[PDB]
Amino acid sequence: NTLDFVDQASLRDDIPTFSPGDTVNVHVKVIEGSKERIQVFKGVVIRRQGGGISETFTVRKESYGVGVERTFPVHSPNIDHIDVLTRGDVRRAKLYYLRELRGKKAKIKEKR
Amino acid sequence: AVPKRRMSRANTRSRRAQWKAEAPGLVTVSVAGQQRKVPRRLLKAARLGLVDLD
Amino acid sequence: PKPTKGPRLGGSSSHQSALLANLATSLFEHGRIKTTEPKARALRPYAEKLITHAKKGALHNRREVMKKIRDKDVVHTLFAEIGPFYADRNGGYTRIIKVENRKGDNAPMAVIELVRE
Amino acid sequence: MIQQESRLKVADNTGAKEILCIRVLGGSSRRYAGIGDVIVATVKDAIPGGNVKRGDVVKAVVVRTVKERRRADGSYIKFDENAAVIIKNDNDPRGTRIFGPVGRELREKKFMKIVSLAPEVL
Amino acid sequence: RKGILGTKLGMTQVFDENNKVVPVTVVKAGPNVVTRIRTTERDGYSAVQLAYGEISPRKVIKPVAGQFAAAGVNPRRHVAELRLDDEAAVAEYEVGQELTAEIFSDGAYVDVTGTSKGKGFAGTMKRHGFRGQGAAHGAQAVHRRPGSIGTPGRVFKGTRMSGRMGNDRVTTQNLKVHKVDAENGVLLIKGAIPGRNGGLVVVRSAIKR
RNA sequence: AUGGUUUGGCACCUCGAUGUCGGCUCGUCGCAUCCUGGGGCUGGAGCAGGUCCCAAGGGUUGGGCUGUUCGCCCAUUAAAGCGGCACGCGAGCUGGGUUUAGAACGUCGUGAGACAGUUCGGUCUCUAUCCGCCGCGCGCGUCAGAAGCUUGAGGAAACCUGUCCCUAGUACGAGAGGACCGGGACGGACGAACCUCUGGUAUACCAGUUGUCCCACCAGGGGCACGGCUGGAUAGCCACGUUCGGACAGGAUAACCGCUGAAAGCAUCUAAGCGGGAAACCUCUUCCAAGACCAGGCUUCUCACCCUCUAGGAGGGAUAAGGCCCCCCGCAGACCACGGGAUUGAUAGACCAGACCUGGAAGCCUAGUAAUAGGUGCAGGGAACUGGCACUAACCGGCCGAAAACUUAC
């Protein structure tokens, strides 16, 4: 992967192990009139498109009756820390079917 | 569309002269002792006895 | 392996699959077959990977081969001598020899055979 | 991506339930309206007792889009519906209450009142 | 105006100090050796000729080997010329001098020149962005053809009709160099530079910025 | 007075056929300029206009109604220009209107029938010879044969614009209102390159599953049903995605503002002269370009061997540098061409490993009456991307391919 020597310089460690299906809350720093604060996005990791530095993962959450999806680069410095709450039990690599499910049907089994 | 006019002999011959065949190149090979010409594309096969030589 | 860039061999993908499986069957059954040069060119990697499956001969690999070969005698030969024969050769189980063009349609012919050196 | 003849739900309490996009303001022959764009819209569905009426030509701002929208930092935001909030010429809501989340793009477009009224800004 | 010959490696992702993402194309600005000086008193124009790439000495034909020997340097695969403006500008290069990546600095604006990808025989829809005709409402076998060609009954020259597309030298202007990695001789250029991976490119200081 | 863009008039042109309106697609030209650019007087205080000169570089929206052009209207916009070219464009498309045969209404006619009145329905043929144009080769030429790198005469492309922030709430103005000049950011539309991201596609990828047949049977699989149907889907191609562009500067100018002054003792931007002055022009940016017959330049390589006629020239043969064919290929490609490799080899395939996609293989064991679940186990399977590896194929090979001299000057 010829560009690996370029890549590893910006690669970011300390990233927790997680898979599509787990429920995580992402600590995202934002700008609100030139001051810092961390906005926590808690939802379900519905996908993860491996690319090394260009790795991206998607977290889906239901908020005030409207579903919201957010895609972040895995090694984005804009994420100070990721915390994994629960491990989900799923049979797919990408959970796109969850875009059509609400409430009771949208729940995820828990890895026991 | 249909040809409006009959081609003259010069134009017909000039265009017709492009329809021709090129001569394949031949290399020498020794099969059963006797030398004979074979295309270089078939050299290995001739050396293996896989092409009929009349 | 690498899918064909152009249109398929038999005139459709399913026909090409059947063609390739039959050609591999005949190749392993006889040891050398004569066919058009595009057919041998497409046949090389396919037969080479079937032989690779046969080399590490387990039940899983046997079933992997059977899901393509469909002929049980050929599978038995492939897992009984062809596999063990190539135990210590890494790739290049087949060779292609170009032969004289066909008469009916001037199709370039080629002969594909297993190496026995 | 909202264009002409597209329908949007109303995220306000003005009595309008659903509007049809007429124009995308912001330059001649402009095509699509993303989060934070102002559109001219006509009310298609309304609450029977509301202040607005069907067929009113109003000005609205898009606050949610189904098509994901890239951000400066390489992250993306995507919602489940296209929603708009009816405004007046001074860029303030004509309603008093905003429903559902909104995008961060309403900050750089100077929709401060809509941002403040929203339940949460993403 | 500085310049160097390089090779397109691929494109990747980096983040600047405001945490924004920068899509960067990696160019191998490998070592170039100056082979010839073009002077006004000799050639009529001032320019400098650079050699790039590594090639086996048994692959170069005799004329090329003789030219490289006359220069005094070992042969390289690729040769190209940089056209300067005046003798005062070309006085700073001399034959055998080696140019590496650090002639550029971070944040500089550069001009990358390469050969575009080949697209083959292309229709007017793709070659020229012609709007098509209707796909229904009675349109008969005209879904992609140009249509009219438009007193003298003559098709004027320059007709934007179908033909071969691509494979032309292209210059992209005002690209910003995000980082100059001196260790690997690699330039990180923000944006997309012409050509396929492994092709030859020329990196020059921008003429405008 | 202009024009033949409107109805005309003539009947010169065609009845051994010149498609009749709009619309779509694609243009090209004019300037009698809609915006942007430079101006001037204002019945111009500023803002904003009015009107007028220069100016054709670019741009000039999407819908409702109607077959429509036209037109009215709805939202915008910097603006929603007017015209020529068979009222451009049917061997490019449409057939809604008009313009055959069917049928009805109103009216006319005793009637057959009729109506530059209405209404519903109603076959749009063709394998491109030549010119033209877009691309691509072969041959020859450029005074020996070749090979690198190039100059450029000459052409082509591109040229749009808004909002906001500072200057400045100042100049002006009773106030309201509202600046000039100059810097900065973010946009719309258009164009190009590209595939890191997003998204699309995926007919040799992975998994689920219905019906049926087969592999003796169970298990496990396979063929067919749009790839049977579904869930995903790397590479390539792409846009809905990313990045970049329109410049800056110089020269000569238009309308115009001027300087220095004659004829014409003053005056006069003028007849001598000299200056400023625009998106137009020439350069400037990008691209093609020596078939540029004035067929260019800087270099580098080979730089020699026979035979025949008759020794005048010619013809033939064999070679060098080099090239081509055959061969292995390519993200180069209709073919051809182009580019790379050819054993002194990583060009392709295989093999090994990785990346990535899928999502937990088979067998066995355990739990359950069974459907099924757990362990072995980030398992197994696999294309394009990357790195190794001569294992297979690039081969004991053919064809092309180098110099009359003379004149003058030095």
Curated annotation (Swiss-Prot), chain A:
Pfam families: Ribosomal_L19
GO biological process, one term: translation
GO cellular component, one term: cytosolic large ribosomal subunit
Top-level taxon: Bacteria
Record-linked InterPro entries: Ribosomal_bL19, Ribosomal_bL19_CS, Ribosomal_bL19_sf, Translation_prot_SH3-like_sf
GO MF term (any one): structural constituent of ribosome
Keywords, sorted A to Z: Ribonucleoprotein, Ribosomal protein
Keyword Ribonucleoprotein (UniProt): yes
PROSITE patterns: RIBOSOMAL_L19 (PS01015)
Family: Belongs to the bacterial ribosomal protein bL19 family.
Database matches in NCBIfam families: rplS_bact (TIGR01024)
Task performed by this protein: This protein is located at the 30S-50S ribosomal subunit interface and may play a role in the structure and function of the aminoacyl-tRNA binding site.
Protein name: Large ribosomal subunit protein bL19
Organism (species): Mycolicibacterium smegmatis (strain ATCC 700084 / mc(2)155)
Curated annotation (Swiss-Prot), chain B:
Gene Ontology terms: cellular component: large ribosomal subunit
GO biological process: translation
Alphabetized GO MF terms: structural constituent of ribosome
One Pfam family, short name: Ribosomal_L32p
Transmembrane annotation, as ranges: none
Keywords, in A-Z order: Ribonucleoprotein, Ribosomal protein
Residue ranges with Basic residues bias: 1-18
Segments for region (Disordered): 1-19
Family as reported in the entry's similarity comment: Belongs to the bacterial ribosomal protein bL32 family.
HAMAP family: Ribosomal_bL32
Protein name in UniProt: Large ribosomal subunit protein bL32
Organism, as annotated: Mycolicibacterium smegmatis (strain ATCC 700084 / mc(2)155)
Swiss-Prot record, chain C:
One GO term describing the cellular component: cytosolic large ribosomal subunit
Protein name as annotated: Large ribosomal subunit protein bL17
Keywords associated with the record: Ribonucleoprotein, Ribosomal protein
Transmembrane segments: none
Source organism superkingdom: Bacteria
Family in the record: Belongs to the bacterial ribosomal protein bL17 family.
GO molecular function, a single term: structural constituent of ribosome
GO biological process: one example: translation
Record carries keyword Signal: no
Self-association state and partner proteins as the record states: Part of the 50S ribosomal subunit. Contacts protein L32.
Curated annotation (Swiss-Prot), chain D:
Gene3D superfamilies, per database record: Ribosomal protein L14
SUPFAM superfamilies, per database record: Ribosomal protein L14
One GO CC annotation: cytosolic large ribosomal subunit
Pfam family name, one: Ribosomal_L14
Listed PROSITE patterns: RIBOSOMAL_L14
One of the GO biological process terms: translation
Gene Ontology terms, MF aspect: large ribosomal subunit rRNA binding; structural constituent of ribosome
InterPro entries (UniProt xref): Ribosomal_uL14 (IPR000218), Ribosomal_uL14_bac-type (IPR005745), Ribosomal_uL14_CS (IPR019972), Ribosomal_uL14_sf (IPR036853)
SMART domains listed in its UniProt record: Ribosomal_L14 (SM01374)
Keywords from the UniProt entry: Ribonucleoprotein, Ribosomal protein, RNA-binding, rRNA-binding
Record's subunit section: Part of the 50S ribosomal subunit. Forms a cluster with proteins L3 and L19. In the 70S ribosome, L14 and L19 interact and together make contacts with the 16S rRNA in bridges B5 and B8.
HAMAP family given in the database record: Ribosomal_uL14
NCBIfam families documented for this protein: rplN_bact
Summary of the function given for this chain in its UniProt record: Binds to 23S rRNA. Forms part of two intersubunit bridges in the 70S ribosome.
Family: Belongs to the universal ribosomal protein uL14 family.
UniProt-recorded name of the protein: Large ribosomal subunit protein uL14
Organism: Mycolicibacterium smegmatis (strain ATCC 700084 / mc(2)155)
Protein encoded by which gene: rplN
